[PDB]
Amino acid sequence: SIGIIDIGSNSIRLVVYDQLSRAPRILFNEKISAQLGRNIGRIDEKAIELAISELTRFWKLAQIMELSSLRTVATAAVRDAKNGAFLLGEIAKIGLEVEVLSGEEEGYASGYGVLSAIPDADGIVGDLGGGSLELIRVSKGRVKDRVSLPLGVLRIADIRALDNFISEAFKKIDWLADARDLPFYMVGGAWRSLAKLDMHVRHYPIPVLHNYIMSPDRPSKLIRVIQRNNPKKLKNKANISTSRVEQLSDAAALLAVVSRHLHSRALVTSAYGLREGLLYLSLDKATRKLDPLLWSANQRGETAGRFYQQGEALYDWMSTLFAQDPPAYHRLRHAACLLADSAWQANPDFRAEQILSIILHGRWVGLDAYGRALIGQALAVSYDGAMDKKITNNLLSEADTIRAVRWGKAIRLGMRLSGGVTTSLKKSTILYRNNKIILQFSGNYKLKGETVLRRLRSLASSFEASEVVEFL
Numbered sequence: 001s002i003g004i005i006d007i008g009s010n011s012i013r014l015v016v017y018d019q020l021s022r023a024p025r026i027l028f029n030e031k032i033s034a035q036l037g038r039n040i041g042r043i044d045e046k047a048i049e050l051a052i053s054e055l056t057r058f059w060k061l062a063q064i065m066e067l068s069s070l071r072t073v074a075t076a077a078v079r080d081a082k083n084g085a086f087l088l089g090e091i092a093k094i095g096l097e098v099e100v101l102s103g104e105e106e107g108y109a110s111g112y113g114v115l116s117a118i119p120d121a122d123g124i125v126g127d128l129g130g131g132s133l134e135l136i137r138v139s140k141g142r143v144k145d146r147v148s149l150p151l152g153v154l155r156i157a158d159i160r161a162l163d164n165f166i167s168e169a170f171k172k173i174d175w176l177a178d179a180r181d182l183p184f185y186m187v188g189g190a191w192r193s194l195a196k197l198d199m200h201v202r203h204y205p206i207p208v209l210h211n212y213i214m215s216p217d218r219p220s221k222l223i224r225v226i227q228r229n230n231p232k233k234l235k236n237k238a239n240i241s242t243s244r245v246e247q248l249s250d251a252a253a254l255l256a257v258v259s260r261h262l263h264s265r266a267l268v269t270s271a272y273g274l275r276e277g278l279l280y281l282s283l284d285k286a287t288r289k290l291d292p293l294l295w296s297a298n299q300r301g302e303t304a305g306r307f308y309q310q311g312e313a314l315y316d317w318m319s320t321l322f323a324q325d326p327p328a329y330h331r332l333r334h335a336a337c338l339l340a341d342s343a344w345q346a347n348p349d350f351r352a353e354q355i356l357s358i359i360l361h362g363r364w365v366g367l368d369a370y371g372r373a374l375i376g377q378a379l380a381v382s383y384d385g386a387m388d389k390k391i392t393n394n395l396l397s398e399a400d401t402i403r404a405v406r407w408g409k410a411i412r413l414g415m416r417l418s419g420g421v422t423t424s425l426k427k428s429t430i431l432y433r434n435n436k437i438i439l440q441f442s443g444n445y446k447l448k449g450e451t452v453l454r455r456l457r458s459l460a461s462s463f464e465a466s467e468v469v470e471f472l
């Protein structure tokens with residue numbers, strides 16, 4: 001239902017989202033490699049010709065998709081070309097009014113994009129685009145400070161000396177000194193592509209874009225990877241075809257110098273950038289505070305489940321076993337319960353495989369790799385799978401491996417007992433007391449049956465407990 005066209009100096013992108021919601025699904029995403037800024041200074045005719053044809057396609061797609069809103073933004077970089085104002089008028093005649101973003105508006109959108117995907121972010125956001133580097137301090141749910149620098153990807157080759165430029169620029173930014181030893185949240189296409197390169201180079205058994213973590217030493221090592229490889233093979237094998245390898249080398253150099261000068265403790269990818277920041281700021285303010293993992297997992301069980309979303313009564317029912325879970329884990333148990341019906345159409349013996357890829361390889365935010373592994377292994381267990389551990393890179397502690405097995409067995413007992421109509425679990429309680437796992441019925445006694453209690457035996461076994469069924 002909504003579209004954003006993001007015009008930069010090094011590429012243009014259309015993204016269509018299913019609705020304006022807390023965590024919307026991407027229906028369509030197309031990046032164009034026209035480089036409006038390369039000829040600064042004047043934008044060259046052939047760039048303009050490429051851009052107007054592509055933008056006209058973006059307009060036409062918006063018409064046939066019947067979008068409820070299409071927003072077009074451009075950077076000040078493009079506007080301030082000698083002929084920038086003329087190009088903006090040529091775009092308007094397509095039917096696309098261009099909203100030119102100041103440095104302030106650009107940095108605020110990129111920073112709230114990271115806060116949308118990572119609500120607890122506390123660090124510096126770096127948006128490396130074609131024409132600018134935006135640096136944004138985020139803390140406490142807010143953008144706190146911001147600077148816009150002329151260090152886009154196109155500008156890096158002209159300098160790269162790179163250390164001295166950053167050193168000089170950084171001296172004038174007085175808030176960097178209070179922001180040391182914090183994460184560096186990377187957004188923009190070049191740095192997201194560099195993280196995909198790192199995943200490939202490292203063979204990291206969970207290739208998650210969102211919240212992928214890199215040491216501050218990785219960028220310097222990636223420069224050497226690019227130099228030590230055939231550029232064509234590297235791009236294709238790492239799934240970053242369309243990236244310009246020379247630009248990626250420049251991006252890595254900049255990342256190394258910026259990270260060192262900011263004293264970044266970790267480099268963290270955000271799947272949400274400027275475009276998702278615009279959406280977040282378009283929300284009602286109270287909607288912004290909703291948890292985007294649980295929002296997105298709720299929507300998935302609504303659209304995929306047999307009886308829409310029944311995970312709420314399931315989470316309520318199973319959580320009396322899990323009251324002592326660490327504070328951060330309750331929302332992960334909840335997200336697993338919301339997704340507990342999402343592989344029902346698969347043949348029984350492959351549902352564990354499916355649900356695991358949905359969790360590990362879905363576009364979830366508000367979650368790190370360890371959390372994906374926890375939810376994914378709980379849900380694999382819920383669908384009668386063993387736990388590979390090598391697909392999850394042995395990330396999990398033994399305590400949390402036991403915890404995931406217990407979550408998964410409780411989920412599947414609840415799902416099998418209720419048939420998936422989890423409202424009926426409102427008349428039941430499942431408890432761990434005195435070395436017993438006790439399924440209590442205060443009502444819906446007819447659900448008990450006999451065979452389904454094999455799931456209770458399994459759960460009891462994972463607790464080293466006596467299976468008990470009690471009617472109250």
Ligand SMILES: [Mg+2]
Pocket residue numbers: 008129130274
């Ligand atoms: Mg940008």
Ligand SMILES: [Mg+2]
Pocket residue numbers: 075106127128129130131132133134152
């Ligand atoms: Mg920019």
